[PDB]
Amino acid sequence: HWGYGKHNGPEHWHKDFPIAKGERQSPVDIDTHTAKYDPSLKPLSVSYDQATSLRILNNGHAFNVEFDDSQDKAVLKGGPLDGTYRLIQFHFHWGSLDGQGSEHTVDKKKYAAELHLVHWNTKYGDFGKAVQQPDGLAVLGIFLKVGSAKPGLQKVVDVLDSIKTKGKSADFTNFDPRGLLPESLDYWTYPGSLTTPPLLECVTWIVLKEPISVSSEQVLKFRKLNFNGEGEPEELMVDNWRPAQPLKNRQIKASFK
Ligand SMILES: NS(=O)(=O)c1ccc(NC(=O)NS(=O)(=O)c2ccc(F)cc2)cn1
Ligand SMILES: [Zn+2]
């Protein structure tokens, strides 16, 4: 039932998913002047050299590039995290216009899109288990702005015509997620949630300060995807972002001065 339309959008989600009004919901606005530098935060460790991408799927709300997470092949460690978190998938949220699309905002600024690299804590054995734990997931969030093309994104962009509609998938092997990362790993971090239903409060959010640049042509191809299934009326997959939620009793920490 849920989606991003007028009658099933983020303002409606709480009826099926009451945790939508919970104490640690995501995304949030990152007020850069109120975030506090935490000198004890360790450097982030992104170890994606052995990543095994498998498939790309249009799930009716975004597209997921899925990875083999049956071994420690692509892992996130360090930063605020205790232990090892395995990459399971990445996806994006984006707008109908370049002035919106990101879920997190920075001093109320919206970016054109936001990349989420989703990882689960290996002490919980699998993803299903992990989402039931307050420290189950670590999502690495990366802002996208429109400017120069991101060469490492192009392989993703070019397969999207083959997964135009909900439920379509395509082989997507040998994709290197390192090509989607910015130069700096400076980040903000806070405890939060999944930003789509079931909105579970299981995520340590790590949001990078440096956005990546993608071209207008690249983002325009995102906007050609469909929310609908094949043979249903076309509704463009755009504005698949949840707006900022109340920070409540949380402090955002910065890894950098
Ligand atoms: N936007 S986000 O916070 O990175 C994010 C990542 C993942 C999800 N949801 C998700 O994976 N849902 S799911 O695949 O159907 C699923 C699978 C297993 C579960 F136990 C619970 C949910 C929602 N949001
Ligand atoms: Zn997401």
PDB file of C-alpha atoms and ligand atoms in Angstrom:
ATOM      1  CA  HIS A   1       0.000   0.000   0.000  1.00  0.00           C
ATOM      2  CA  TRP A   2       2.722   2.490   0.989  1.00  0.00           C
ATOM      3  CA  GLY A   3       4.582   4.630  -1.523  1.00  0.00           C
ATOM      4  CA  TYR A   4       5.425   8.246  -2.281  1.00  0.00           C
ATOM      5  CA  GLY A   5       2.102   9.469  -3.732  1.00  0.00           C
ATOM      6  CA  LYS A   6      -0.401  11.941  -2.249  1.00  0.00           C
ATOM      7  CA  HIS A   7      -2.528   9.192  -0.714  1.00  0.00           C
ATOM      8  CA  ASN A   8       0.166   6.694   0.357  1.00  0.00           C
ATOM      9  CA  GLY A   9       3.195   8.954   0.975  1.00  0.00           C
ATOM     10  CA  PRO A  10       5.399   9.545   4.058  1.00  0.00           C
ATOM     11  CA  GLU A  11       2.609  11.391   5.919  1.00  0.00           C
ATOM     12  CA  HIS A  12       0.460   8.233   5.746  1.00  0.00           C
ATOM     13  CA  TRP A  13       3.059   5.638   6.751  1.00  0.00           C
ATOM     14  CA  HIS A  14       2.401   5.893  10.495  1.00  0.00           C
ATOM     15  CA  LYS A  15      -1.016   4.207  10.123  1.00  0.00           C
ATOM     16  CA  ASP A  16       0.545   0.899   9.020  1.00  0.00           C
ATOM     17  CA  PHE A  17       3.926   1.542  10.703  1.00  0.00           C
ATOM     18  CA  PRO A  18       3.425   3.399  14.016  1.00  0.00           C
ATOM     19  CA  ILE A  19       7.211   3.509  14.588  1.00  0.00           C
ATOM     20  CA  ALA A  20       7.118   6.246  11.908  1.00  0.00           C
ATOM     21  CA  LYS A  21       6.594   8.635  14.866  1.00  0.00           C
ATOM     22  CA  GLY A  22       9.290   6.938  16.951  1.00  0.00           C
ATOM     23  CA  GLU A  23      12.225   8.252  18.959  1.00  0.00           C
ATOM     24  CA  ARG A  24      15.009   7.611  16.414  1.00  0.00           C
ATOM     25  CA  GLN A  25      13.557   8.033  12.941  1.00  0.00           C
ATOM     26  CA  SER A  26      15.497   8.862   9.774  1.00  0.00           C
ATOM     27  CA  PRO A  27      16.348  10.870   7.798  1.00  0.00           C
ATOM     28  CA  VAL A  28      17.152  14.070   9.711  1.00  0.00           C
ATOM     29  CA  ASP A  29      18.453  17.522   9.005  1.00  0.00           C
ATOM     30  CA  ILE A  30      22.150  17.748   9.834  1.00  0.00           C
ATOM     31  CA  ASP A  31      22.673  21.107  11.499  1.00  0.00           C
ATOM     32  CA  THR A  32      26.409  21.493  10.885  1.00  0.00           C
ATOM     33  CA  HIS A  33      26.937  24.078  13.606  1.00  0.00           C
ATOM     34  CA  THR A  34      25.229  21.930  16.281  1.00  0.00           C
ATOM     35  CA  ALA A  35      26.929  18.634  15.342  1.00  0.00           C
ATOM     36  CA  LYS A  36      29.827  18.046  17.728  1.00  0.00           C
ATOM     37  CA  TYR A  37      33.294  16.876  16.766  1.00  0.00           C
ATOM     38  CA  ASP A  38      33.979  13.588  18.575  1.00  0.00           C
ATOM     39  CA  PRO A  39      37.765  13.060  18.663  1.00  0.00           C
ATOM     40  CA  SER A  40      37.399   9.447  19.829  1.00  0.00           C
ATOM     41  CA  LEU A  41      35.603   8.467  16.585  1.00  0.00           C
ATOM     42  CA  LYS A  42      37.973   6.190  14.657  1.00  0.00           C
ATOM     43  CA  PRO A  43      38.625   6.544  10.941  1.00  0.00           C
ATOM     44  CA  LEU A  44      36.043   4.789   8.789  1.00  0.00           C
ATOM     45  CA  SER A  45      37.241   1.547   7.172  1.00  0.00           C
ATOM     46  CA  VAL A  46      35.615   0.838   3.802  1.00  0.00           C
ATOM     47  CA  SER A  47      36.945  -2.462   2.458  1.00  0.00           C
ATOM     48  CA  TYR A  48      35.227  -3.128  -0.865  1.00  0.00           C
ATOM     49  CA  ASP A  49      38.101  -4.755  -2.847  1.00  0.00           C
ATOM     50  CA  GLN A  50      36.480  -8.220  -2.759  1.00  0.00           C
ATOM     51  CA  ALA A  51      32.914  -7.037  -3.424  1.00  0.00           C
ATOM     52  CA  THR A  52      30.719  -9.382  -5.467  1.00  0.00           C
ATOM     53  CA  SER A  53      27.761  -7.600  -7.017  1.00  0.00           C
ATOM     54  CA  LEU A  54      25.121  -9.994  -8.343  1.00  0.00           C
ATOM     55  CA  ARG A  55      21.944  -8.358  -9.524  1.00  0.00           C
ATOM     56  CA  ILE A  56      20.060  -5.101  -9.949  1.00  0.00           C
ATOM     57  CA  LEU A  57      16.363  -5.007  -9.013  1.00  0.00           C
ATOM     58  CA  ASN A  58      13.548  -2.496  -9.440  1.00  0.00           C
ATOM     59  CA  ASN A  59      11.508  -3.095  -6.271  1.00  0.00           C
ATOM     60  CA  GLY A  60       8.814  -0.491  -6.974  1.00  0.00           C
ATOM     61  CA  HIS A  61      10.297   2.189  -4.719  1.00  0.00           C
ATOM     62  CA  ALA A  62      13.953   2.352  -5.829  1.00  0.00           C
ATOM     63  CA  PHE A  63      16.498   0.066  -7.491  1.00  0.00           C
ATOM     64  CA  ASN A  64      18.881  -2.115  -5.490  1.00  0.00           C
ATOM     65  CA  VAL A  65      22.287  -3.309  -6.577  1.00  0.00           C
ATOM     66  CA  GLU A  66      22.616  -6.506  -4.552  1.00  0.00           C
ATOM     67  CA  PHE A  67      25.810  -8.154  -3.343  1.00  0.00           C
ATOM     68  CA  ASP A  68      26.882 -11.572  -2.160  1.00  0.00           C
ATOM     69  CA  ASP A  69      26.834 -11.160   1.624  1.00  0.00           C
ATOM     70  CA  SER A  70      27.411 -14.840   2.478  1.00  0.00           C
ATOM     71  CA  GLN A  71      31.061 -14.028   3.355  1.00  0.00           C
ATOM     72  CA  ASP A  72      33.122 -11.040   4.524  1.00  0.00           C
ATOM     73  CA  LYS A  73      33.755  -9.705   0.988  1.00  0.00           C
ATOM     74  CA  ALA A  74      32.741  -6.041   1.195  1.00  0.00           C
ATOM     75  CA  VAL A  75      32.715  -4.681   4.737  1.00  0.00           C
ATOM     76  CA  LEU A  76      32.403  -1.478   6.708  1.00  0.00           C
ATOM     77  CA  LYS A  77      34.235  -1.174  10.039  1.00  0.00           C
ATOM     78  CA  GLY A  78      35.611   1.524  12.321  1.00  0.00           C
ATOM     79  CA  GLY A  79      34.085   4.952  12.721  1.00  0.00           C
ATOM     80  CA  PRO A  80      31.314   4.691  15.330  1.00  0.00           C
ATOM     81  CA  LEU A  81      30.901   0.976  14.670  1.00  0.00           C
ATOM     82  CA  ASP A  82      31.735  -1.998  16.836  1.00  0.00           C
ATOM     83  CA  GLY A  83      32.460  -5.089  14.774  1.00  0.00           C
ATOM     84  CA  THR A  84      32.034  -5.893  11.107  1.00  0.00           C
ATOM     85  CA  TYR A  85      29.157  -4.857   8.863  1.00  0.00           C
ATOM     86  CA  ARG A  86      28.631  -6.604   5.494  1.00  0.00           C
ATOM     87  CA  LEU A  87      27.471  -4.815   2.360  1.00  0.00           C
ATOM     88  CA  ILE A  88      24.165  -6.318   1.189  1.00  0.00           C
ATOM     89  CA  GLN A  89      22.904  -3.708  -1.287  1.00  0.00           C
ATOM     90  CA  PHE A  90      23.002  -0.108  -2.372  1.00  0.00           C
ATOM     91  CA  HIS A  91      20.302   2.110  -3.787  1.00  0.00           C
ATOM     92  CA  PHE A  92      19.464   5.769  -4.284  1.00  0.00           C
ATOM     93  CA  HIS A  93      16.718   8.263  -3.493  1.00  0.00           C
ATOM     94  CA  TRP A  94      16.226  11.117  -5.958  1.00  0.00           C
ATOM     95  CA  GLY A  95      13.988  13.955  -7.023  1.00  0.00           C
ATOM     96  CA  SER A  96      11.929  15.087  -9.983  1.00  0.00           C
ATOM     97  CA  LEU A  97      14.073  18.251 -10.007  1.00  0.00           C
ATOM     98  CA  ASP A  98      17.749  18.834  -9.179  1.00  0.00           C
ATOM     99  CA  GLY A  99      16.784  20.963  -6.136  1.00  0.00           C
ATOM    100  CA  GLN A 100      15.387  17.988  -4.211  1.00  0.00           C
ATOM    101  CA  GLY A 101      15.846  14.256  -3.817  1.00  0.00           C
ATOM    102  CA  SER A 102      18.093  13.631  -0.823  1.00  0.00           C
ATOM    103  CA  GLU A 103      16.671  12.291   2.420  1.00  0.00           C
ATOM    104  CA  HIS A 104      19.185  13.800   4.793  1.00  0.00           C
ATOM    105  CA  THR A 105      19.626  17.535   4.484  1.00  0.00           C
ATOM    106  CA  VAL A 106      22.592  19.695   5.504  1.00  0.00           C
ATOM    107  CA  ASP A 107      21.594  22.988   7.133  1.00  0.00           C
ATOM    108  CA  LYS A 108      18.249  22.397   5.386  1.00  0.00           C
ATOM    109  CA  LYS A 109      19.948  22.022   1.977  1.00  0.00           C
ATOM    110  CA  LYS A 110      18.511  19.251  -0.180  1.00  0.00           C
ATOM    111  CA  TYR A 111      20.795  17.494  -2.677  1.00  0.00           C
ATOM    112  CA  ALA A 112      19.634  16.041  -6.007  1.00  0.00           C
ATOM    113  CA  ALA A 113      19.942  12.483  -4.737  1.00  0.00           C
ATOM    114  CA  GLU A 114      21.342  10.317  -1.967  1.00  0.00           C
ATOM    115  CA  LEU A 115      23.155   6.990  -2.205  1.00  0.00           C
ATOM    116  CA  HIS A 116      22.668   4.423   0.575  1.00  0.00           C
ATOM    117  CA  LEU A 117      25.164   1.600   0.961  1.00  0.00           C
ATOM    118  CA  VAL A 118      23.421  -0.775   3.330  1.00  0.00           C
ATOM    119  CA  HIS A 119      25.445  -3.030   5.649  1.00  0.00           C
ATOM    120  CA  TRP A 120      24.459  -5.503   8.383  1.00  0.00           C
ATOM    121  CA  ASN A 121      26.249  -6.453  11.592  1.00  0.00           C
ATOM    122  CA  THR A 122      27.724  -9.950  11.121  1.00  0.00           C
ATOM    123  CA  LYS A 123      27.163 -10.718  14.942  1.00  0.00           C
ATOM    124  CA  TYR A 124      23.465 -11.182  14.027  1.00  0.00           C
ATOM    125  CA  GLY A 125      24.045 -13.768  11.286  1.00  0.00           C
ATOM    126  CA  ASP A 126      21.797 -12.323   8.595  1.00  0.00           C
ATOM    127  CA  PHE A 127      19.939  -9.199   7.510  1.00  0.00           C
ATOM    128  CA  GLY A 128      16.533 -10.306   8.811  1.00  0.00           C
ATOM    129  CA  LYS A 129      17.942 -10.856  12.287  1.00  0.00           C
ATOM    130  CA  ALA A 130      20.007  -7.613  12.125  1.00  0.00           C
ATOM    131  CA  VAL A 131      17.035  -5.292  11.454  1.00  0.00           C
ATOM    132  CA  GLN A 132      15.534  -6.366  14.808  1.00  0.00           C
ATOM    133  CA  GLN A 133      18.577  -4.980  16.685  1.00  0.00           C
ATOM    134  CA  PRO A 134      19.360  -1.352  17.606  1.00  0.00           C
ATOM    135  CA  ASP A 135      22.884  -1.779  16.179  1.00  0.00           C
ATOM    136  CA  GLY A 136      21.893  -4.136  13.369  1.00  0.00           C
ATOM    137  CA  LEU A 137      22.675  -2.011  10.329  1.00  0.00           C
ATOM    138  CA  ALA A 138      25.140   0.603   9.216  1.00  0.00           C
ATOM    139  CA  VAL A 139      24.065   2.705   6.245  1.00  0.00           C
ATOM    140  CA  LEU A 140      26.687   4.804   4.509  1.00  0.00           C
ATOM    141  CA  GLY A 141      24.926   7.845   3.031  1.00  0.00           C
ATOM    142  CA  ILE A 142      26.479   9.854   0.198  1.00  0.00           C
ATOM    143  CA  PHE A 143      24.979  12.985  -1.323  1.00  0.00           C
ATOM    144  CA  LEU A 144      24.751  13.472  -5.085  1.00  0.00           C
ATOM    145  CA  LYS A 145      24.901  16.889  -6.722  1.00  0.00           C
ATOM    146  CA  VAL A 146      24.504  17.629 -10.423  1.00  0.00           C
ATOM    147  CA  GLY A 147      27.667  18.722 -12.233  1.00  0.00           C
ATOM    148  CA  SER A 148      30.382  16.579 -13.802  1.00  0.00           C
ATOM    149  CA  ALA A 149      29.581  12.935 -14.559  1.00  0.00           C
ATOM    150  CA  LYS A 150      30.542  10.202 -12.116  1.00  0.00           C
ATOM    151  CA  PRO A 151      32.284   7.667 -14.375  1.00  0.00           C
ATOM    152  CA  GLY A 152      31.840   4.837 -11.849  1.00  0.00           C
ATOM    153  CA  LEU A 153      28.065   5.376 -11.878  1.00  0.00           C
ATOM    154  CA  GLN A 154      27.648   4.937 -15.629  1.00  0.00           C
ATOM    155  CA  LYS A 155      27.422   1.118 -15.621  1.00  0.00           C
ATOM    156  CA  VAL A 156      24.457   1.449 -13.244  1.00  0.00           C
ATOM    157  CA  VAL A 157      22.792   4.132 -15.373  1.00  0.00           C
ATOM    158  CA  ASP A 158      23.111   2.089 -18.573  1.00  0.00           C
ATOM    159  CA  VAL A 159      21.357  -1.019 -17.206  1.00  0.00           C
ATOM    160  CA  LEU A 160      18.283   0.894 -15.955  1.00  0.00           C
ATOM    161  CA  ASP A 161      16.361   0.559 -19.236  1.00  0.00           C
ATOM    162  CA  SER A 162      16.365  -3.231 -18.637  1.00  0.00           C
ATOM    163  CA  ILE A 163      14.691  -2.826 -15.210  1.00  0.00           C
ATOM    164  CA  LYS A 164      12.253  -0.035 -16.054  1.00  0.00           C
ATOM    165  CA  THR A 165       9.298  -1.433 -14.103  1.00  0.00           C
ATOM    166  CA  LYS A 166       8.551  -2.895 -10.669  1.00  0.00           C
ATOM    167  CA  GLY A 167       9.708  -6.508 -10.264  1.00  0.00           C
ATOM    168  CA  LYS A 168      12.252  -6.458 -13.105  1.00  0.00           C
ATOM    169  CA  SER A 169      15.803  -7.564 -12.349  1.00  0.00           C
ATOM    170  CA  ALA A 170      18.961  -8.001 -14.386  1.00  0.00           C
ATOM    171  CA  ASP A 171      22.375  -9.591 -13.909  1.00  0.00           C
ATOM    172  CA  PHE A 172      24.795  -7.043 -12.498  1.00  0.00           C
ATOM    173  CA  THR A 173      28.099  -8.733 -11.785  1.00  0.00           C
ATOM    174  CA  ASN A 174      31.563  -7.238 -11.357  1.00  0.00           C
ATOM    175  CA  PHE A 175      30.398  -3.771 -10.364  1.00  0.00           C
ATOM    176  CA  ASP A 176      32.870  -1.942  -8.133  1.00  0.00           C
ATOM    177  CA  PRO A 177      31.139   0.230  -5.520  1.00  0.00           C
ATOM    178  CA  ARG A 178      34.465   2.019  -4.802  1.00  0.00           C
ATOM    179  CA  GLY A 179      33.739   4.062  -7.934  1.00  0.00           C
ATOM    180  CA  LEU A 180      30.793   5.744  -6.145  1.00  0.00           C
ATOM    181  CA  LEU A 181      32.817   7.109  -3.201  1.00  0.00           C
ATOM    182  CA  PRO A 182      34.059  10.675  -2.750  1.00  0.00           C
ATOM    183  CA  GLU A 183      37.701  11.495  -1.958  1.00  0.00           C
ATOM    184  CA  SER A 184      37.120  12.257   1.727  1.00  0.00           C
ATOM    185  CA  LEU A 185      35.540   9.909   4.255  1.00  0.00           C
ATOM    186  CA  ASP A 186      34.768  12.744   6.729  1.00  0.00           C
ATOM    187  CA  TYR A 187      31.315  11.980   8.123  1.00  0.00           C
ATOM    188  CA  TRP A 188      28.478  12.755  10.503  1.00  0.00           C
ATOM    189  CA  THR A 189      26.934   9.917  12.491  1.00  0.00           C
ATOM    190  CA  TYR A 190      23.787   9.391  14.551  1.00  0.00           C
ATOM    191  CA  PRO A 191      21.428   6.550  15.594  1.00  0.00           C
ATOM    192  CA  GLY A 192      18.425   6.242  13.304  1.00  0.00           C
ATOM    193  CA  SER A 193      16.124   4.049  11.253  1.00  0.00           C
ATOM    194  CA  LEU A 194      15.280   2.606   7.888  1.00  0.00           C
ATOM    195  CA  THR A 195      13.837   5.457   5.823  1.00  0.00           C
ATOM    196  CA  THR A 196      11.210   3.252   4.160  1.00  0.00           C
ATOM    197  CA  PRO A 197       8.731   0.876   5.787  1.00  0.00           C
ATOM    198  CA  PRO A 198       9.127  -1.014   8.031  1.00  0.00           C
ATOM    199  CA  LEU A 199      11.050   2.054   9.375  1.00  0.00           C
ATOM    200  CA  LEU A 200      12.885  -0.124  11.905  1.00  0.00           C
ATOM    201  CA  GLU A 201      15.114   1.685  14.390  1.00  0.00           C
ATOM    202  CA  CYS A 202      18.164  -0.458  13.670  1.00  0.00           C
ATOM    203  CA  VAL A 203      20.556   1.850  11.787  1.00  0.00           C
ATOM    204  CA  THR A 204      23.787   3.574  12.678  1.00  0.00           C
ATOM    205  CA  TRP A 205      23.812   6.312  10.060  1.00  0.00           C
ATOM    206  CA  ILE A 206      27.146   7.428   8.643  1.00  0.00           C
ATOM    207  CA  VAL A 207      26.632  10.348   6.251  1.00  0.00           C
ATOM    208  CA  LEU A 208      29.639  11.597   4.286  1.00  0.00           C
ATOM    209  CA  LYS A 209      30.294  15.336   4.196  1.00  0.00           C
ATOM    210  CA  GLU A 210      31.663  15.352   0.639  1.00  0.00           C
ATOM    211  CA  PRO A 211      29.046  14.812  -2.063  1.00  0.00           C
ATOM    212  CA  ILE A 212      29.803  13.103  -5.347  1.00  0.00           C
ATOM    213  CA  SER A 213      28.983  14.858  -8.614  1.00  0.00           C
ATOM    214  CA  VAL A 214      26.831  13.178 -11.247  1.00  0.00           C
ATOM    215  CA  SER A 215      25.797  14.596 -14.606  1.00  0.00           C
ATOM    216  CA  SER A 216      22.376  15.892 -15.541  1.00  0.00           C
ATOM    217  CA  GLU A 217      22.189  13.031 -18.081  1.00  0.00           C
ATOM    218  CA  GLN A 218      22.936  10.472 -15.380  1.00  0.00           C
ATOM    219  CA  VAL A 219      20.210  11.694 -13.023  1.00  0.00           C
ATOM    220  CA  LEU A 220      17.735  12.116 -15.910  1.00  0.00           C
ATOM    221  CA  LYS A 221      18.081   8.379 -16.557  1.00  0.00           C
ATOM    222  CA  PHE A 222      17.159   7.672 -12.900  1.00  0.00           C
ATOM    223  CA  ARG A 223      13.976   9.668 -13.555  1.00  0.00           C
ATOM    224  CA  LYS A 224      12.955   7.409 -16.468  1.00  0.00           C
ATOM    225  CA  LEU A 225      12.382   4.435 -14.174  1.00  0.00           C
ATOM    226  CA  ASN A 226       8.815   3.478 -13.222  1.00  0.00           C
ATOM    227  CA  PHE A 227       7.161   2.841  -9.843  1.00  0.00           C
ATOM    228  CA  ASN A 228       4.582   0.707 -11.661  1.00  0.00           C
ATOM    229  CA  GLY A 229       4.817  -2.809 -13.029  1.00  0.00           C
ATOM    230  CA  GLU A 230       4.913  -3.575 -16.753  1.00  0.00           C
ATOM    231  CA  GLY A 231       1.479  -3.133 -18.353  1.00  0.00           C
ATOM    232  CA  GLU A 232       0.289  -0.768 -15.604  1.00  0.00           C
ATOM    233  CA  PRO A 233      -0.159   2.992 -16.065  1.00  0.00           C
ATOM    234  CA  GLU A 234       3.236   4.733 -16.166  1.00  0.00           C
ATOM    235  CA  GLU A 235       4.195   6.613 -13.037  1.00  0.00           C
ATOM    236  CA  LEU A 236       7.766   7.897 -13.109  1.00  0.00           C
ATOM    237  CA  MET A 237       9.990   6.808 -10.231  1.00  0.00           C
ATOM    238  CA  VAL A 238      10.844  10.276  -8.891  1.00  0.00           C
ATOM    239  CA  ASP A 239      10.746  11.886  -5.438  1.00  0.00           C
ATOM    240  CA  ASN A 240      11.222   8.562  -3.667  1.00  0.00           C
ATOM    241  CA  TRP A 241      12.616  10.310  -0.591  1.00  0.00           C
ATOM    242  CA  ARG A 242      11.319  10.651   2.943  1.00  0.00           C
ATOM    243  CA  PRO A 243      11.645  14.173   4.368  1.00  0.00           C
ATOM    244  CA  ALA A 244      13.599  15.039   7.514  1.00  0.00           C
ATOM    245  CA  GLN A 245      12.170  13.691  10.783  1.00  0.00           C
ATOM    246  CA  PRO A 246      12.378  15.192  14.287  1.00  0.00           C
ATOM    247  CA  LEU A 247      15.812  14.774  15.869  1.00  0.00           C
ATOM    248  CA  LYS A 248      14.281  14.293  19.330  1.00  0.00           C
ATOM    249  CA  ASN A 249      16.794  13.107  21.959  1.00  0.00           C
ATOM    250  CA  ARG A 250      19.761  12.635  19.628  1.00  0.00           C
ATOM    251  CA  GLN A 251      23.124  14.268  19.033  1.00  0.00           C
ATOM    252  CA  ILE A 252      24.769  14.166  15.636  1.00  0.00           C
ATOM    253  CA  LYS A 253      28.520  13.617  15.941  1.00  0.00           C
ATOM    254  CA  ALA A 254      31.135  14.740  13.402  1.00  0.00           C
ATOM    255  CA  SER A 255      34.343  12.861  12.590  1.00  0.00           C
ATOM    256  CA  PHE A 256      36.069  16.100  11.601  1.00  0.00           C
ATOM    257  CA  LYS A 257      36.778  19.600  12.881  1.00  0.00           C
TER     258      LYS A 257
HETATM  259  N1  LIG B   1      16.593   3.702   2.931  1.00  0.00           N
HETATM  260  S1  LIG B   1      17.399   2.737   3.919  1.00  0.00           S
HETATM  261  O1  LIG B   1      17.274   3.291   5.245  1.00  0.00           O
HETATM  262  O2  LIG B   1      18.767   2.629   3.526  1.00  0.00           O
HETATM  263  C1  LIG B   1      16.679   1.297   3.862  1.00  0.00           C
HETATM  264  C2  LIG B   1      17.314   0.068   3.619  1.00  0.00           C
HETATM  265  C3  LIG B   1      16.543  -1.109   3.595  1.00  0.00           C
HETATM  266  C4  LIG B   1      15.158  -1.022   3.823  1.00  0.00           C
HETATM  267  N2  LIG B   1      14.222  -2.011   3.836  1.00  0.00           N
HETATM  268  C5  LIG B   1      14.362  -3.292   3.505  1.00  0.00           C
HETATM  269  O3  LIG B   1      15.443  -3.804   3.271  1.00  0.00           O
HETATM  270  N3  LIG B   1      13.200  -3.962   3.431  1.00  0.00           N
HETATM  271  S2  LIG B   1      13.080  -5.523   3.076  1.00  0.00           S
HETATM  272  O4  LIG B   1      14.056  -5.900   2.086  1.00  0.00           O
HETATM  273  O5  LIG B   1      11.763  -5.771   2.571  1.00  0.00           O
HETATM  274  C6  LIG B   1      13.275  -6.338   4.435  1.00  0.00           C
HETATM  275  C7  LIG B   1      13.912  -7.580   4.441  1.00  0.00           C
HETATM  276  C8  LIG B   1      14.069  -8.273   5.640  1.00  0.00           C
HETATM  277  C9  LIG B   1      13.587  -7.728   6.826  1.00  0.00           C
HETATM  278  F1  LIG B   1      13.736  -8.396   7.982  1.00  0.00           F
HETATM  279  C10 LIG B   1      12.950  -6.490   6.822  1.00  0.00           C
HETATM  280  C11 LIG B   1      12.793  -5.796   5.629  1.00  0.00           C
HETATM  281  C12 LIG B   1      14.609   0.224   4.056  1.00  0.00           C
HETATM  282  N4  LIG B   1      15.354   1.320   4.071  1.00  0.00           N
HETATM  283 ZN    ZN B   2      17.685   4.405   1.332  1.00  0.00          ZN
END
